């Protein structure tokens, strides 16, 4: 719920702009944290994508995360 | 008047004045320091003072040629 | 005395305006500009112009056959046409893209908005006078009253100096972007055509005789359009109360090899702003009578070129 | 061969030299450094060059297991060593600090912290001693953690020690003109001779070497004492000065420095006191040959004034010829000096001395000819710089109109003082008056009229030492206070060049400081109080202030009215130009002086006015003096030919380089009008280089020699030979970088090596370029460009470094290099650090063209202009042809081209505006199109290169038609495309004619399997998911043709002129990310990855730096990145949107351009500066939005690299959404 | 003498004969000291009417051989 009160300079608009476009903040989530948070999610992946309930991969978890 | 009188504006003030006064008082004091008697109050050759008040004291501000 | 006059006017002109402040666009103006842009002349394509300048040229038809590069005035013709076209293209393009934002479509520019505001007011936009460093072209006050008028006159004379290709009499010095090149080209012409070698370039010096006559080739040029300030041509006298800026008669030039204080020396300023820049050349004006030259020097005479 | 190349290098590199230099054994442990490490570093560099050279070649199967490990170790050991040695320097500064008892007591805490670091450091040293070999020593892992934390703590220790540094600076003046850490190094001598022998330059004016004689005192170790002083210029040429009074080293550094200064002053005084008798006793030649330069000039002046005086009184007694006899004596002296000492002489210093005398004597006799003054009191005699060496009170005294002051006795040796025009007399009188009233002159005018040099010369003649600095916007008042304190304490003169370009409030407080000192000096008070500085401080009278401000540019403020009071103005608008020339020609020793002077003046004037107006032209005094200092040698050569010939040759051949194509005829037609006697002369041609150039031009594969290259490269050689630095102005794709590279090669071939560094100034912030004071922790950071400077200008090297800036020329960053590019050739910082230039180094700019340059930077450096027609696109095509006859040389070069030559030369210019084509959305120069079509055609034929199959002529003609259909057709709309198509029908090789049912040539493609023109889009529906994303995208025609074009370029393996980079153009909402993402899904993430990014207006270079660093996550240059070994792609939606600066040059894309062109960039992690990360593998793709009008455009220099083509709307949208409705 | 073999000019002979730079500049060409230029700074591969100079030197050389 950003409004005119929630802008004090341009820069906020830049960060939100890229949030609309990509959603990956450079090294906000990758400060040695992306892997612990992603590891807290693969249990859902075991049924969600359902790779025959066998296995998964590593980068594809980030792909599913940006998707979510 | 404007450009008829001076090509651009110049900021003459008193600093140049008492500079010139300090010069010419030195000149007269050290002229008459050797004068044991004044024919009619002085024996000055006032052409150097012309050159000084022309080109040195007031010459600082002047950026044009014609103004010289 | 007449100096007084101008001062008071500008003084009065601001004073009321001060108190005048204390009291409690995108319309047919762009259509007026739209009608304007179909009145300035067309471009001159260089593929045609290089041809035309190469086809015909000489100082004197008897002296030489037609030729291009070699004669200074032809290369000057090419340089002047080049800069003129450089300005013409810019004006046509920006008028277009100023009107092609509303009637046309494009994401609005700040420069174009400034251009709109300038078009409504008297002052032309900065886009046609200056650049980040400096690109002074023809800075005059009005939008079209004199600015485009001056540019039109320049292009008219330049075209007739080209399309016919014949050298006319009574050159207009104000039109040329670089007057000094005109004069030095005249020098080179005299050295080559005459006394060639008997006369060296560094030996030649300069002088002028004022054609004291109303009603009227040899070496030198005929200049039209200079303006004096504060006396007559010859038998110089005190100016009357009105008519501060007076015409200048035909000051035909003269050049001579060197050596082969009653005289007074005047400057020649392009614009009436009067700086070190715009000093094209200096002219000796012997017409003294009883008043010694220093009288005139303090009186600040000059032979300016434009009148604004 | 290659196995030998690895074997013997391994045999040597395992068995390396291990010789190290120990500081001393003065405790249990020993601390050491490698004084051979230059050999280590350099031989390492070409080692890794050799190893990469091998690995890149095809036939290097086995070495990968071995070589990588080897390179890895080498790479790794380097940075460890570097960190270590840097820490050593820190420790090597701080040891003598904590040896003293009082300072260690007064701050116990960090003294014990230093006890702790001493323990840890000794442990590291003993581990290294145990190892005996530096490579296992570096291999230790524990070390690496300690080293940077130790570094940070030692920075903290220095931040403790500033409080003592201020007092130590107080105890001796000159240290105010020295920065902090170099002051620490100066104070940690640890030796009499060695430590300070490399620092005499930046602590006195002109001294560089001093002998050290050990006097063996009884039971004390022999003390080294100074006995003579030396000024070295060049290599062997020098000036020596004995001393009778000696100077002895001691225990306190301030003491022997002070004694050095004093005893210098005293012996200079006494030698002069003698020399003033010898001048009139011995006679002219003997004392001029015997004495040094400074004393000789003093002697000449004093002789002339005394004799002229004597003549004037003798006139006063009665009408006498004796005044005329004295004038005649001077005239006689002229011939004897001029005849012999000028033409023949040994050595540079001795040479400079003579003409320094000659110029003075010329002016001397010129004055004495017209000197119609009746007596001493006359003004005409009381207008020049007279001198009197008073005997009754033994002292010099120099005199002006009224002012007087004593000579300040500073040894300068031979300096190239300058001519005396009347304008210099106006300055001399003005400055003498202002100093008599206790002010500071502040001359003003346009650029290059002799302001700074006039100030410096009035300093030199009065015997004082001047200290030029260079203010800039990154200054702070503390450093100005430091300077002014040094000035008042010492007795020296300051000349704050470019004083105006400085912050406003800093000027506000400087007003106070200078007013305080003015009032202090006015009273004649020995001791005074300085603002902001609590301790009381003394004064010496003979000080002065000068600012050479520059009225009116971009980035120039005004002086608030508090500060205009102090300084008196001196208007220097138009320098004289004739008298200086004529007296310089006299100084060299010419005979046709007066005519030639007029020739110079008139020629340069006419050239200035009536020639075409271009921004980069310059004809000021810098150019003229360059010509003069050139012209000395030519007369010094044996030829007695007529001078005017030599001079025409010199002028013409100097000024040719800058001129654009058109102005050359006008220039030499103008030459003919002034020297009609002379017809022509050949250009003096240097045989070695001209024979050498074709050799390496043939050595390369893809290089065609043409005469224009000979001309331009030789001109570059000459301007290199004369001037400091230079610029290569010229449009894109014109061969500038190649010219520089080949020149460096030829110079290196005949010995005398040459190295080149590159930089991009507007892809880093100027604050980082020159470094600032940190805005958080109150502590300095190093600057990149200054780090390269310090690393480069060390003596005792063999390179000849050429620092290349490469970008635009914006005034703000460049203009604070005026001092380095001026005759001062000294760099000055806001740190307070001053670094002296050497002849080892040159500065070059590979800039396109100036549009934001004042003449103060145009006239400082020489220049060379490349033109578009010097290297036509055709020559580039022939170079590619030379490559095709390298390996695929069966017949292909001939066959391919037999269409290409006529099919390209006589066609390309009939598309620009023959037919209308009036919407080329991307305005370009057509060389880019040629590079494009060549890069496309190589990918077209790559398949049949792969299978080693050679085809007929007709198929090749079809291929060329296909290639160049796009890549000149990629920038047009359907209407222009059909007109294009009709052209190709009229006058070109066959296009599809089988059906052509209202379908353009673009619609079809040539098939590899057979000579056919077909096209289709394969059927494919969706997966079962129903999310709109799961209905991602469908197989369109537009997408398929886009993949078709893209894939060709993207398969090509990094050929020259191929960056492997692409770029689309299409309206906002014309299937950009659609087609790109369709491509991107088809990647194989097992050996091919991908990355996304977007652009907005306020995205800065630091942001792009961050995202690319996070993308790679490794420095793949130093044998790293297993996970980035797969190939990656960087995709950007819109390169236009970044904010164009006001000038017109946007500052974000430049980082990208240095990334594409060269790969890598400079780091900014507050730890090390001069070094760059390297990208050994990457890929690049972009997308535009129909530039023009409201939409921005990219820098034109960057357009040369990306494949560009349109992305039209589909016109088939009934057939895109059909399937989803079917399902 | 012979136009086929004896007339065959060596690069030294060619360079000296060009270095004579006698005439032929009816259009107007600049110094032959380094390079000829047609109009505006445009290098010319050769002196414009070189052939007449070749013929003149061949005539003189035939007289010398006589
Ligand atoms: N002797 C040569 N023969 C054939 N091709 C050449 C030769 N010299 C240069 N080239 C080609 O010219 C191009 C050189 O462009 P260069 O990189 O020099 O441009 P530049 O002048 O440095 O300007 P920018 O740095 O902006 O590109 C390359 O494509 C190169 O292959
Ligand atoms: N009277 C002179 N005699 C000799 N050289 C001069 C004279 N005037 C100017 N110069 C030359 O001009 C250059 C100095 O210009 P400078 O004063 O640095 O320009 P700026 O004042 O714009 O910094 C030097 O090469 C210097 O020798
Ligand atoms: N092949 C396709 N199949 C289905 N939808 C498509 C296809 N191509 C384009 N579109 C739709 O058209 C739109 C075009 O938007 P896009 O090209 O991303 O904007 P821009 O051109 O500014 O990048 C997309 O949002 C997409 O939904």
Spatial separation of the terminal alpha carbons of chain A: 20 Å
> Could you tell me how far the N terminus lies from the C terminus of chain E, measured between alpha carbons in angstroms?
9 Å
Number of DSSP helices of chain A? 4
How helix-rich are the residues of chain E, as a percent range?
25-40%
Helix content of chain A: 40-55%
Q: SSE order of chain E, as H and E?
A: HH
Enumerate the distinct ligands: adenosine-5'-triphosphate, adenosine-5'-diphosphate
Oligomerization: part of a larger assembly
Class by alpha and beta content of chain E:
mainly alpha
Any descriptors?
part of a larger assembly; 5 chains; A: 68 residues; mainly alpha; 49% helix; elongated; E: 66 residues; binds adenosine-5'-triphosphate; binds adenosine-5'-diphosphate
Question: Mind explaining what this structure looks like?
Answer:
Chain A starts with 10 loop residues before the first helix and ends with a helix. Chain A is 49% helix and 0% strand. Chain A has helices at 11-21, 34-39, 42-48, 59-67. The longest helix of chain A is centred in the first third of the chain and has 11 residues, at 11-21. The radius of gyration of chain A is 16 Å and the shape is elongated. Chain A is an all-alpha fold and 68 residues long. With 66 residues, chain E is an all-alpha fold. In chain E, 2% of the residues are buried. Chains in contact: A-D, B-C, B-D, C-D, D-E. The B-D interface holds B 11, 15, 19, 22-23, 26, 47-48, 51, 55-56, 59-63, 65 and D 379, 402, 426, 429-430, 433, 437, 564-565, 568-571, 573-574. The PDB classes it as motor protein. The entry lists the keywords Cilia, motor protein. The entry is titled "Outer Dynein Arm-Shulin complex - Dyh3 motor region (Tetrahymena thermophila)".
């Amino acid at each position: 719920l950003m409004t005119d009160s929630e802008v004090k300079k341009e820069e906020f608009l830049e960060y939100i702009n890229m949030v609309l476009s990509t959603g990956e903040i450079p090294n906000l989530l990758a400060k040695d944290e992306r892997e612990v948070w992603l590891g807290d999610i693969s249990q859902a992946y075991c049924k969600e994508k359902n790779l025959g309930n066998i296995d998964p991969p590593q980068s594809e978890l980030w792909t599913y995360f940006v998707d979510r | 008047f404007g450009p008829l009188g001076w090509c651009v504006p110049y900021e003459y003030n008193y600093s140049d004045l008492e500079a010139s006064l300090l010069y010419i008082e030195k000149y007269l004091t050290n002229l008459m320091s050797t004068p044991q008697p004044n024919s009619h109050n002085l024996p000055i050759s006032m052409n150097v003072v012309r050159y000084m008040i022309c080109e040195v004291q007031y010459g600082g501000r002047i950026t044009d040629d014609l103004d010289r | 005395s007449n100096a007084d006059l101008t001062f008071r006017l500008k003084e009065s002109k601001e004073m009321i305006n001060t108190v005048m402040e204390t009291r409690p666009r995108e319309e047919i103006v762009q259509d007026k500009a739209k009608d304007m842009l179909k009145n300035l002349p067309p471009d001159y394509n260089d593929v045609e112009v290089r041809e035309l300048v190469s086809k015909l040229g000489g100082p004197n038809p008897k002296t030489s056959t037609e030729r291009g590069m070699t004669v200074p005035l032809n290369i000057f013709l090419y340089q002047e046409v080049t800069r003129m076209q450089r300005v013409i293209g810019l004006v046509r393009k920006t008028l277009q893209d100023t009107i092609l934002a509303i009637d046309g479509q494009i994401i609005m520019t700040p420069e174009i908005l400034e251009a709109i505001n300038a078009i409504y007011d008297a002052k032309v936009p900065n886009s046609w006078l200056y650049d980040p460093s400096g690109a002074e072209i023809s800075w005059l006050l009005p939008n079209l009253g004199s600015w485009s008028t001056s540019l039109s006159d320049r292009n008219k004379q330049l075209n007739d100096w080209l399309r016919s290709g014949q050298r006319p009499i009574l050159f207009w010095l104000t039109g040329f972007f670089n007057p000094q090149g005109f004069l030095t080209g005249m020098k080179q012409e005299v050295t080559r055509n005459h006394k060639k070698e008997a006369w060296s370039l560094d030996d030649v010096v300069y002088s002028t005789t004022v054609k004291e006559r109303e009603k009227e080739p040899a070496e030198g040029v005929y200049i039209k359009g200079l303006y004096l300030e504060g006396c007559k041509w010859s038998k110089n006298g005190l100016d009357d109360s009105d008519p501060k800026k007076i015409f200048a008669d035909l000051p035909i030039l003269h050049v001579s090899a060197i050596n082969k204080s009653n005289t007074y020396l005047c400057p020649v300023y392009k614009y009436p702003k009067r700086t070190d820049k715009y000093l094209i050349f200096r002219v000796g004006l012997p017409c003294e009578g009883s008043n010694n030259p220093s009288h005139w020097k303090l009186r600040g005479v000059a032979l300016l070129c434009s009148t604004e | 061969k290659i196995r030998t190349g690895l074997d013997e290098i391994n045999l040597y590199w395992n068995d390396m030299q291990f010789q190290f230099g120990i500081w001393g054994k003065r405790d249990v442990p020993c601390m050491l450094n490698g004084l051979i490490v230059g050999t280590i570093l350099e031989r390492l560099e070409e080692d890794q060059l050799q190893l990469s050279t091998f690995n890149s070649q095809r036939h290097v199967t086995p070495f990968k297991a071995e070589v990588e490990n080897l390179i890895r170790t080498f790479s790794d050991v380097n940075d460890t060593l570097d960190m270590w040695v840097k820490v050593q320097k820190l420790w090597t500064s701080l040891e003598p600090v904590f040896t003293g008892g009082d300072i260690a007591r007064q701050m116990p805490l960090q003294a014990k912290q230093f006890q702790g670091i001493d323990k840890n450091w000794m442990k590291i040293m003993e581990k290294a001693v145990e190892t005996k070999k530096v490579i296992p020593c570096c291999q230790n892992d524990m070390l690496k953690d300690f080293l940077p934390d130790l570094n940070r703590k030692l920075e903290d220790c220095q931040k403790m020690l500033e409080a003592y540094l201020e007092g130590k600076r107080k105890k001796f003046p000159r240290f105010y003109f020295v920065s902090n850490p170099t002051l620490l190094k100066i104070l940690s001598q640890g030796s009499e001779p060695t430590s300070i022998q490399e620092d005499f330059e930046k602590l006195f004016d002109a001294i560089t070497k001093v002998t050290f004689e050990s006097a063996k005192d009884k039971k004390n170790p022999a003390l080294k004492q100074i006995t003579q002083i030396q000024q070295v210029i060049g290599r062997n040429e020098e000036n020596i000065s004995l001393t009778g009074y000696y100077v002895k080293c001691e225990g306190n550094i301030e003491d022997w420095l002070k004694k050095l200064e004093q005893n210098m002053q005293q012996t200079l005084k006494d030698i002069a006191s003698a020399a003033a008798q010898q001048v009139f006793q011995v006679g002219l030649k003997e004392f001029v040959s015997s004495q040094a330069s400074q004393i000789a000039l003093l002697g000449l002046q004093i002789l002339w004034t005394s004799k002229v005086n004597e003549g004037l009184e003798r006139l006063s007694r009665n009408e006498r010829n004796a005044m005329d006899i004295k004038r005649n004596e001077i005239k006689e002296h002229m011939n004897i000096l001029s005849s012999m000492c000028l033409e023949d002489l040994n050595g540079a210093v001795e040479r400079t001395k003579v003409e320094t005398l000659v110029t003075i004597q010329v002016h001397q006799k010129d004055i004495s000819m017209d000197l119609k003054c009746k007596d001493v009191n006359d003004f005409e005699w009381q207008k020049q710089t007279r001198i009197a060496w008073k005997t009754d009170i033994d002292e010099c005294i120099i005199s002006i109109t009224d002012w007087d002051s004593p000579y300040s006795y500073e040894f300068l040796g031979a300096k190239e003082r300058l001519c005396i025009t009347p304008l210099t007399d106006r300055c001399y009188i003005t400055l003498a008056q202002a100093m008599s009233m206790y002010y500071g002159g502040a001359p003003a005018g346009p650029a290059g009229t002799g302001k700074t040099e006039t100030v410096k010369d009035l300093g030199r003649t009065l015997g004082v030492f001047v200290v030029v600095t260079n203010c800039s916007d990154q200054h702070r008042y503390r450093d100005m206070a430091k300077i002014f304190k040094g000035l008042v304490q010492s007795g020296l003169w300051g000349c704050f060049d470019e004083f105006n370009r400085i912050d406003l409030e800093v000027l506000s407080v400087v007003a106070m400081q200078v007013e305080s000192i003015t009032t202090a000096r006015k009273q004649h008070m020995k001791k005074f109080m300085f603002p902001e500085e609590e301790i009381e401080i003394e004064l010496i009278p003979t000080v002065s202030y000068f600012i050479t401000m520059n009225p009116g540019y971009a980035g120039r403020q005004e002086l608030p009215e508090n500060l205009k009071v102090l300084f008196r103005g001196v208007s220097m608008m138009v320098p004289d130009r004739e008298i200086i020339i004529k007296v310089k020609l006299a100084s060299v020793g010419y005979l046709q002086i007066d005519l030639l002077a007029k020739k110079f003046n008139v020629l340069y004037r006419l050239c200035e006015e009536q020639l075409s107006k271009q921004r980069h032209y310059d004809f000021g005094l810098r150019n003229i003096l360059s010509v003069l200092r050139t012209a000395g040698n030519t007369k010094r050569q044996e030829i007695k030919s007529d001078e005017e010939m030599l001079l025409m040759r010199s002028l013409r051949d100097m000024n040719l380089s800058k001129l654009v194509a058109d102005d050359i005829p006008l220039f030499n037609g103008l030459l003919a009008d002034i020297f009609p006697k002379l017809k022509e002369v050949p250009k003096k041609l240097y045989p070695d280089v001209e024979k050498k150039i074709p050799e390496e031009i043939n050595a390369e594969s893809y290089l065609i020699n043409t005469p224009s290259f000979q001309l331009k490269i030789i001109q570059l050689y000459e301007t290199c030979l004369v001037r400091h630095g230079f610029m290569l102005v010229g449009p894109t794709g014109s061969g500038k970088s190649t010219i520089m590279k080949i020149l460096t090669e030829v110079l290196t071939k005949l010995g005398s090596p040459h190295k080149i560094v590159i930089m991009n100034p507007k892809a880093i912030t100027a604050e980082q370029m020159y470094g600032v004071k940190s805005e958080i922790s109150d502590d300095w950071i190093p600057g990149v460009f200054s780090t390269i400077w310090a690393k480069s200008n060390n003596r005792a090297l063999k390179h000849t470094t050429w620092i290349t800036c490469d970008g635009p020329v914006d005034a703000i960053w460049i203009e604070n290099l005026n001092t380095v590019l001026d005759d001062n050739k000294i760099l000055t910082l806001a740190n307070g650090e001053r670094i002296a230039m050497t002849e080892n180094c040159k500065v070059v700019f590979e800039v396109e063209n100036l549009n934001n340059a004042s003449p103060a930077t145009v006239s400082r450096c020489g220049q060379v202009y490349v033109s578009p027609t010097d290297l036509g696109y055709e020559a580039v095509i022939e170079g590619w042809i030379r490559n095709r006859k390298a390996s695929g040389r069966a017949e292909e070069s001939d066959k391919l081209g037999n269409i290409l030559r006529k099919y390209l030369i006589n066609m390309r210019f009939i598309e620009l505006q023959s037919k209308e084509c009036k919407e080329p959305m991307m305005d370009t120069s057509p060389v880019i199109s040629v590079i494009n079509i060549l890069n496309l055609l190589t990918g077209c034929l790559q398949y049949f290169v792969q299978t080693q199959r050679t085809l007929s002529e007709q198929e090749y003609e079809k291929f060329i038609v296909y290639s160049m259909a796009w890549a000149i057709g990629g920038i047009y709309e359907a209407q222009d495309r059909v007109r294009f198509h009709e052209l190709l029908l009229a006058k070109n090789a066959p296009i599809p004619q089988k059906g052509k049912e209202n379908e353009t040539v673009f619609d079809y493609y040539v098939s590899q399997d057979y000579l056919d023109w077909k096209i289709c889009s394969p059927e494919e529906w969706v997966p079962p998911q129903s999310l709109q994303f799961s209905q991602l995208l469908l197989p369109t025609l537009d997408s398929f043709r886009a993949e078709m074009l893209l894939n060709f370029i993207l398969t090509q393996p990094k050929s020259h002129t191929c960056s492997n980079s692409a770029l689309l153009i299409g309206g906002s909402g014309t299937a950009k990310t659609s087609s790109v993402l369709l491509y991107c899904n088809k990647f194989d993430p097992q050996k091919m990855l991908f990355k996304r990014t977007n652009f907005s207006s306020a995205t800065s270079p630091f942001m792009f730096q961050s995202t690319i660093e996070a993308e790679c996550d490794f420095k793949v240059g130093k044998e790293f990145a297993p996970p980035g070994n797969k190939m990656m792609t960087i995709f950007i939606d819109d390169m236009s949107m970044p904010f164009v600066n006001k000038w017109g040059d946007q500052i974000t894309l430049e980082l990208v351009r240095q990334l594409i062109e060269t790969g890598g960039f400079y780091m900014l992690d507050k730890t090390q500066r001069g070094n760059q990360r390297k990208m050994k593998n990457l890929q690049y793709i972009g997308a535009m939005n129909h530039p023009g009008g409201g939409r921005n455009d990219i820098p034109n220099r960057l357009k040369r690299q990306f494949f560009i083509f349109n992305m039209i709307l589909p016109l088939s949208i009934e057939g895109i959404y059909g399937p989803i409705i079917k399902h | 003498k012979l136009r086929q073999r004896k007339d065959l000019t060596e690069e030294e002979i060619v360079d000296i004969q060009f270095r004579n730079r006698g005439e032929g500049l009816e259009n107007g060409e600049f110094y032959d000291g380094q390079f000829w230029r047609n109009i505006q700074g445009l290098i010319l591969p050769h002196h414009p009417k070189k052939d007449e100079f070749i013929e003149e030197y061949l005539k003189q050389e035939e007289v010398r051989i006589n």
